[PDB]
Amino acid sequence: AVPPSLRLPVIEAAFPRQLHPYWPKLQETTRTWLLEKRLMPADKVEEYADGLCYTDLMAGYYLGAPDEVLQAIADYSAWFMVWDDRHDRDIVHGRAGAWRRLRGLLHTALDSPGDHLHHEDTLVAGFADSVRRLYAFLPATWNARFARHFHTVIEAYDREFHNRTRGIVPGVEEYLELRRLTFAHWIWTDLLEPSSGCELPDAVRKHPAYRRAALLSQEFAAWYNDLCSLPKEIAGDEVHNLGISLITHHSLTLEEAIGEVRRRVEECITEFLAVERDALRFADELADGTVRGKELSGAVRANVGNMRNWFSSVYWFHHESGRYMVDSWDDRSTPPYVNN
Numbered sequence: 001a002v003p004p005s006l007r008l009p010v011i012e013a014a015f016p017r018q019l020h021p022y023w024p025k026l027q028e029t030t031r032t033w034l035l036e037k038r039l040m041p042a043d044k045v046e047e048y049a050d051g052l053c054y055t056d057l058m059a060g061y062y063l064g065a066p067d068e069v070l071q072a073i074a075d076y077s078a079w080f081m082v083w084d085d086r087h088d089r090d091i092v093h094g095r096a097g098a099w100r101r102l103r104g105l106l107h108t109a110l111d112s113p114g115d116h117l118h119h120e121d122t123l124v125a126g127f128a129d130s131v132r133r134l135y136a137f138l139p140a141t142w143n144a145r146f147a148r149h150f151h152t153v154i155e156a157y158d159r160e161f162h163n164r165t166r167g168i169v170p171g172v173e174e175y176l177e178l179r180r181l182t183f184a185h186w187i188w189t190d191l192l193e194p195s196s197g198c199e200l201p202d203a204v205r206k207h208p209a210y211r212r213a214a215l216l217s218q219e220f221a222a223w224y225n226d227l228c229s230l231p232k233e234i235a236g237d238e239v240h241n242l243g244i245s246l247i248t249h250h251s252l253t254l255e256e257a258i259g260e261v262r263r264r265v266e267e268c269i270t271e272f273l274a275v276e277r278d279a280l281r282f283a284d285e286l287a288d289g290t291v292r293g294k295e296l297s298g299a300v301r302a303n304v305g306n307m308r309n310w311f312s313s314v315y316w317f318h319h320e321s322g323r324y325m326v327d328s329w330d331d332r333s334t335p336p337y338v339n340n
């Protein structure tokens with residue numbers, strides 16, 4: 001059961017959870033990867049990794065993915081969690097130089113991951129290993145789009161570094177634009193395609209129904225994260241959160257901001273339900289009787305189905321993962337799974 005302040009009855013009633021059959025092997029393989037790439041200390045891997053539920057999150061999202069595709073996605077996603085932790089710790093400890101150098105190496109490794117597989121910085125080497133594997137599934141045109149999207153994500157993280165160092169809370173609209181990048185909306189959307197085995201042509205993925213369904217899936221996920229991660233983020237002096245922007249710039253109380261974020265999250269669901277009908281009609285239209293048409297139709301249908309799965313996976317992840325359980329920590333500002 002979910003606390004009433006975080007409960008979304010429409011998710012529970014209309015978005016039933018799904019789990020990829022590879023999940024049991026995925027859980028252990030990603031844990032071993034985190035250990036072997038030295039992305040987390042061995043004792044913290046053993047104590048916390050399974051409880052963090054990072055593989056559960058992805059195995060509830062990219063249904064139908066080939067096992068090796070899901071493995072690369074899960075490793076990359078766990079890396080992404082550790083990177084968020086490193087970014088936070090660099091801010092907290094004022095390591096502007098270390099952040100800047102890491103930022104530059106990630107930009108370079110993103111374009112040439114093979115060159116960085118054995119880099120002295122284990123965080124860079126881990127990134128490169130996952131990215132090189134992601135680059136082996138689809139044509140180089142997809143790889144170039146992934147890279148373009150992630151260069152933008154890195155710079156959004158750099159903007160967050162500047163905001164927190166300068167004591168700046170973004171305005172609400174500024175935040176919503178930034179959040180599409182710090183949450184990596186377009187990366188998760190890109191990764192639908194290797195999961196269904198097909199790079200979608202620009203004309204297909206830029207169709208308004210596909211774009212809008214993809215957007216709303218990610219807006220829900222990011223703002224639901226904001227709702228559930230607000231306590232940990234307040235305790236950690238994090239400033240990036242829709243609720244924090246509302247409190248700071250619209251002078252809402254903590255209770256008023258929670259209610260406002262909740263209402264915006266709820267609206268994402270029913271806006272998605274409306275556009276999902278249009279997106280599945282588009283999927284039907286692509287089935288024009290040709291082989292390629294059947295392939296594109298099936299791929300769009302699978303991707304839209306996983307856009308829907310993201311709602312339930314993200315919902316339950318926030319209640320299962322130890323990442324957000326600030327009430328259990330000795331130091332509310334320092335999560336125990338983080339390298340401080």
Ligand SMILES: CC[N+](CC)(CC)Cc1ccccc1
Binds near residue numbers: 184
């Ligand atoms: C730091 C976490 N994350 C993914 C690694 C950054 C993009 C957002 C996220 C949080 C919770 C669920 C799903 C994604």
Ligand SMILES: [Mg+2]
Binds near residue numbers: 084088
């Ligand atoms: Mg964070």
Ligand SMILES: [Mg+2]
Binds near residue numbers: 084182
């Ligand atoms: Mg973050």
Ligand SMILES: [Mg+2]
Binds near residue numbers: 225226229230233
């Ligand atoms: Mg958060």
